[PDB]
Structure formats: C-alpha cells, structure tokens
Amino acid sequence: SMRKPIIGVMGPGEQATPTDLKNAYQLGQLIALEGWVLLTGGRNVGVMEHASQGAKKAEGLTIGILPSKNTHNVSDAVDIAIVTGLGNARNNINVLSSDVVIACGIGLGTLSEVALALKNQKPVILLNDDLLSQELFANLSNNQVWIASSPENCIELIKSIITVKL
Template sequence: MRTTVIGVMGPGNGAREIDRHVAKELGSAIASQGWILLTGGRNTGVMEAASQGAKQAGGLTIGILPTATDEGMSEAVDIAIFTDLGSARNNINVLSSHAIVACGMGAGTASEVALALKAKKPVILLNCDRTTQAFFENLSSDNLWIAETVEEAIAILQNALIKG
C-alpha cells in the first residue's frame, strides 16, 4: 500500500494571512502523522505555507507545478512534478491525493474541491466561510467535512482514511 498523500489546496497570491497561518500549522500536522504533503508547489500563499510547515516538521513534500520549469517553485518542495498544464494540473493534485484539505478558498481551490468530490475523495473544508461550505454541501454531502481547527481536520482525516 502506498504512503498516505494529503493534498492541501488553497489560494496562492490571494491567500489571507489567516489562510497562510493555518496552512503552515496544517502542513506541520500532516508531516507529524507521517503522511506526505502534496500542494500546487508554488512559492506563494497556502502552497508555500503548508510546504514550509511540513518541511519544518521533517515531512516529505510534493509540488504539482503548473509550469514546465522551477521558476516560482517553493524551496520547501522535495519532489517537483512539472506539468506545463496551468490550472489543468488541478485534476492531478486531486487524483494523486488520498484526501484533500481546502484551506481558504479561491477559484482554483474551488475547482479542486469540486474535482475531489466528483472523484469521491474525502474533502475537508478548513478556514472556509459559511457560504462556501453551503455551496459544496449542496453539491455533495458525501465525503465532505467541515473543520474549525487543524486538530479537527487531522482527526477527520484519520477517520476518513480508515474508512476509505
């Protein structure tokens, strides 16, 4: 059985400070579980913060980059996958992960959450407002959880992965 890969998705340039703070804590918690962190690999927003958190906790990080080169790549990415696919890489992010945690929300993150729900992957919304939560709950309440804290997200992941 392959090692558990947890995808952390969230805004890049549009990330709020709280999104970056929570993502860094989440990356660290994922690494502490012995799971591999997967992000979009860029050196901005949630991707950068989660990767930094995982690296600081001694974890392994994968970055699925939208480009063909390492320009703009996070220095905290251990394994870089260069796709040259732009936003089309979002499906690779989802299908390569056992579960997805959306930390904050933007258009790219929304597409990843929708793809994950369609693929029947466990999805956790963390640090997302009530309007966003309601939207995704209306799409599919199966495999969708809402977490208020990183600790709650980790507990949900542990449960979802056991059932999966």
C-alpha cells in the same frame, strides 16, 4: 497499498487571509508529524508555500504538482517537483493523487479543485470562513464534504477517513 497517506493542501495565494496562512503552516507541520506526505500545487506564495514550509519544519516529504513546463518558480520547501506543463489542467492530478484534499481558505483555483475532488468522490475537508462555499459543496456532494474547525480537527478527520478506507 504500503504507501504513506498523501494529503493535498489547496488554498489561495496572495489573497490568503492571515488565518489561512497560519492554518496552512500548522497543517503542514501536523501532516509531516504523522509521517504523511504533503501534496500541493507548488505555488511559491500563500497557502501552498506555508503548508510546504510547515511540513519541512517537521522533516516531512513535500510534493509539488507544477503547472509550468520547468522548475524556475518552485520554492526550496518542495522536495519533489512534478513538472506538468498543463497549466490549470494539473488541478485534476492534485485531486486524483491525494487520499484526502484539504481546502485551506477559498479562491477561484481552490473552488475548481474542491469541485473536481468531489466529482471524483475524493474525501474533502474545508477549513475556511466561507459559509456560501460550505453550503454549496454540501448540497452538490449530498453532504459528503467535511467542515473542519481547526488544523488539529483536519488531522482527526483524516484519521477517521483513512481508517474507513482500511
């Protein structure tokens, strides 16, 4: 493949913590500064939107995988709107399309995406303060999930992951 790495950033919306939102915005910037593509589920609030705005601040390309049948809710920070009409079934597209999936914070939708990514043997990085989810996913994935300490650490982990792929 000559394609740029695609990094999926998943996380909560309205219930994202202040730390999740700061982490998301920083991640978006850092992904774009590497020349990587950012993929999100296209939500116009919370982690996905802060990540997308971060990437755009650093002139990166952003892809949104929308659950709706139209673009009515997509933000200006999404360059490419993939309109699925699949509702929450689109979560599987997010994970299959990503070279690495980062869960920035935790919530029900994020839990579903992490679970699907690990079932598909996709590399997953958790960036959150939820020890229960970390232990549960480590157990179910036979310790294949990665736990990051910061946005910068996520980028370091991605570089090690995509180097082993190569």
